[PDB]
Design a protein around this nucleic acid. Structure first.
Lengths: 117, 91, 70, 178, 107
RNA sequence: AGGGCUACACACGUGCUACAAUGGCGCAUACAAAGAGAAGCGACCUCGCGAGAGCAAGCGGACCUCAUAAAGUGCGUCGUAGUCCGGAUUGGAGUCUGCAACUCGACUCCAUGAAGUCGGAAUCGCUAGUAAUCGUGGAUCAGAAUGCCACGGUGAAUACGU
RNA sequence: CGCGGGGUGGAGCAGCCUGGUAGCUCGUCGGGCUCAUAACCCGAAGAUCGUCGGUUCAAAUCCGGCCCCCGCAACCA
RNA sequence: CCUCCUAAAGAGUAACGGAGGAGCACGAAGGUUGGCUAAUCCUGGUCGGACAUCAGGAGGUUAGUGCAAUGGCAUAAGCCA
């Protein structure tokens, strides 16, 4: 198990876990649990194989993590590409977002080192 | 990311030229200082472009470009430094 | 054949026509006919009259005058 | 193996007429899948090579056995023949049954973009690919819940063109790379 | 062309700073031509300039060592410090700015 | 009219925020001061996941709203796992003022995701309703602060010696 | 167209006893620090180990050619 | 003292004559029996690196040979059990 990407946690509650399917934060996790008809919470260890699965399936309503991602990766490529600000940024490796650049960033410039501009 | 008010700005300082363009063809680029103004369906299929501060920068508008602002086409910015940019090119 | 593990198909090929936590007929794409493309074209593919969340209906007759609360 | 049984019963009889051979002896087949598991640099650690042999001990009933450096450009301590991988050469029933675990139980391992590469065939009847993770075949549906390592593939066929490579086993539900 | 300053950093500190010029070769037989940037109101009161008296002093400096011909000289910018500078500094400064850069770049 | 003041492998001064567990999260729950509002502030009520919008009592504020102030108190849950912490970055969508949010504003929702394990040579504020620590309001202000000015909540340790 | 020793990061020096880069110390660079800098203190970077070729899984390290530095040989009569 | 060349097609053979090696190693690097066959380049794939491996093709022995080099070596005098 699988539901998730071969993976599922475990002792974690579940609303937590299910999130490592990806494309699924708390909002979703609660939801698709729920839906499914199960639950949030119960540990992932307390759900049966038929409940897991029924969950899965119900998940699915969401895309696979590879995909989400990719869609994110192709969205970045795209802005670059279209040649917009972002594209120019992406790309670069600089903050898109409106941050900032005199200080900070870093997240991105990386670590750190004196300029040779 | 992010957003702006729904029904985005078009624009008159651009629209006055867009209505002329589609009749004139494209033969020279439209372009203008407006940016921001939104790219609308629409002004698609011609070269605009746009001032940025700066010079006018020609770009043909497909679409894929609708809902963006004219100034995104574009750059105002340059520097540099580390990055900036390509490696890759030589001049 | 100096066998170190035993191959068996009965636990893994039975009821494989459906998708479940133990086996699935096929993977993503090909036989599953999955689509993986990207697109843009924002706002203008829909109707351009769109409005915010609010208590009123479309083409309403009035608007409460805030200074007229006195 | 059901994949080879279907291929001889249905597909070979059609390839006979699609390529219009004079003899039934001209129709293509897979000869062997030879493998490597070329993780490399493992002479400096040994436990990485033992863990790669323990993944190959679970893909088939056959025993794991080392592959070695020949040009040996990196260097560690011993000259030339330092180990890099753990092989297992599959043929006939031991390769046809493995390709039948793909997209039936190994569905999270195999993606559309990681399918059969139609451009990678050659008229010599030689092929190769990477799968970047280990893919096991136990007596039941099971996974060892361990990752890190991956496997690479080497295949020989009787195909006399790269177009007959694209026809060999091509009726199965395994995706094609694009 | 580029600029020259006399500023120092080791003592308490400063002894500032400074001037920048354009010195550019002209058509043969054009002779010697003058412009400022800052002398509109700021360089600037006797300082206009300086600086011109500085170029005339600079005619007894160089690499070979003497006279100007290419050429036109332009006083593009600079900065005095009020409690140490005078007409300058000027600048004394201005034929050092002209000599250095002429040395940098070549004559 | 458009651009720039906001660019960018840097460094610093001053500020914020986290690394959690005498903390976070979900639910239940107690006790404030102060201040603005005549093309302005605003409950009940209605619409939406929500910013917000609609509808609209009240008022020029000892007459109203921000507002169940939060820390704190009750209950479940986490066991040091880079997490049930942190949430920079980054994709998508919605709301807002305004001629207009592209470079380059604010707010909201979904998703994604990194440094960070309490930090060197070193250093600064404070003697009690103080420091430490929790929240609130206003000027300026089409819109728009983690700064500034003012506010109330909880509330220490130690003071030999000179 | 001899012989012996030498050729290391900005600078001096260790090494090799046939190898597995980068040591020690001054300098440099940023930081703590000072009114500021010398300087103390903290931390980081560097480099075709003369060079081209040879041996080797691996060469600054072993070996040949060559370029450069210093010393020795460099007439008895 | 060994190998190639000096060396002149029976044979021997010089000069601080030109080049390279020898001061030991191996209980497996020995006997015997069965079988096997390369440097290098191209082709194909990726965690798989770098130019690194498995497989196939070309090459058709160049490789390998306990220790430089010639001679010799596939019926192997090479290699594995």
């Amino acid at each position: 198990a699988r539901i998730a990407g071969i993976n599922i946690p475990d002792h974690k509650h579940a609303v937590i876990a299910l999130t490592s399917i990806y494309g699924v934060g708390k909002t979703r996790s609660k939801a698709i649990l729920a839906a499914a008809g199960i639950a949030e919470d119960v540990k992932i260890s307390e759900l049966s194989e038929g409940q897991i699965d029924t969950l899965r399936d119900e998940v699915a309503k969401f895309v696979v993590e590879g995909d989400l991602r990719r869609e994110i990766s192709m969205s970045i490529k795209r802005l670059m590409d279209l040649g917009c600000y972002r594209g120019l940024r992406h790309r670069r490796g600089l903050p898109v977002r409106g941050q900032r650049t005199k200080t900070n960033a870093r997240t991105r410039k990386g670590p750190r080192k004196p300029i040779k501009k | 990311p992010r957003s702006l008010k729904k029904g985005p700005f078009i624009d008159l300082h651009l629209l006055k030229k867009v209505e002329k363009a589609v009749e004139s063809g494209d033969k020279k680029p439209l372009r203008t200082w407006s940016r921001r103004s939104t790219i609308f369906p629409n002004m698609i299929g011609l070269t605009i472009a746009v001032h940025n501060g700066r010079q006018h920068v020609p770009v043909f508008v497909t679409d894929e470009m609708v809902g963006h602002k004219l100034g995104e086409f574009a750059p105002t910015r340059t520097y540099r430094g580390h990055a900036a940019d390509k490696k890759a090119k030589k001049k | 054949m100096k066998k170190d593990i035993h191959p068996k198909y009965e636990e893994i090929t039975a009821s494989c026509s459906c998708g479940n936590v133990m086996k699935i007929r096929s993977t993503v794409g090909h036989d599953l006919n999955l689509d993986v493309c990207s697109k843009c074209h924002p706002f203008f593919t829909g109707k351009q009259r769109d409005v915010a969340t609010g208590g009123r209906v479309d083409r309403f007759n009035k608007r409460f005058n805030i200074p007229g609360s006195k | 193996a059901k994949l080879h049984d279907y291929y001889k019963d249905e597909v070979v009889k059609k390839l006979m007429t699609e390529f219009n051979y004079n003899s039934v002896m001209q129709v293509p087949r897979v000869e062997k899948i030879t493998l490597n598991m070329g993780v490399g640099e493992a002479i400096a650690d040994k436990k990485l090579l033992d863990n790669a042999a323990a993944d190959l001990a679970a893909i088939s009933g056959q025993k794991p056995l080392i592959t070695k450096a020949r040009k040996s450009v990196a260097g560690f301590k011993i000259r030339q023949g330092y180990p890099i991988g753990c092989k297992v050469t599959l043929r006939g029933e031991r390769m046809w049954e493995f390709f039948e675990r793909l997209i039936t139980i190994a569905v999270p391992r195999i993606r559309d973009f990681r399918g059969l590469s139609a451009k990678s065939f050659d008229g010599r009847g030689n092929y190769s690919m990477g799968v970047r993770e280990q893919i096991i075949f136990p007596e039941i549906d099971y996974d060892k819940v361990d990752r890190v390592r991956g496997l690479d593939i080497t295949i020989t066929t009787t195909a006399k063109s790269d177009e007959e490579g694209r026809a060999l086993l091509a009726a199965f539900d395994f995706p094609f790379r694009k | 062309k580029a600029e020259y300053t006399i500023h120092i950093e080791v003592p308490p500190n400063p002894f500032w700073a400074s001037v920048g010029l354009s010195i550019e070769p002209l058509p043969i037989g054009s002779g010697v031509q003058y412009e400022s940037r800052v002398s509109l109101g700021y360089l600037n009161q006797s300082f206009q300039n300086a600086v011109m008296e500085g170029v005339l002093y600079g005619c007894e400096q160089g690499l070979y060592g003497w006279k100007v011909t290419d050429c036109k000289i332009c006083f593009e910018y600079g900065l005095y410090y009020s409690p140490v500078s005078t007409p300058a500094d000027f600048r004394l400064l201005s034929p050092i700015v002209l000599e250095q850069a002429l040395k940098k770049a070549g004559t």
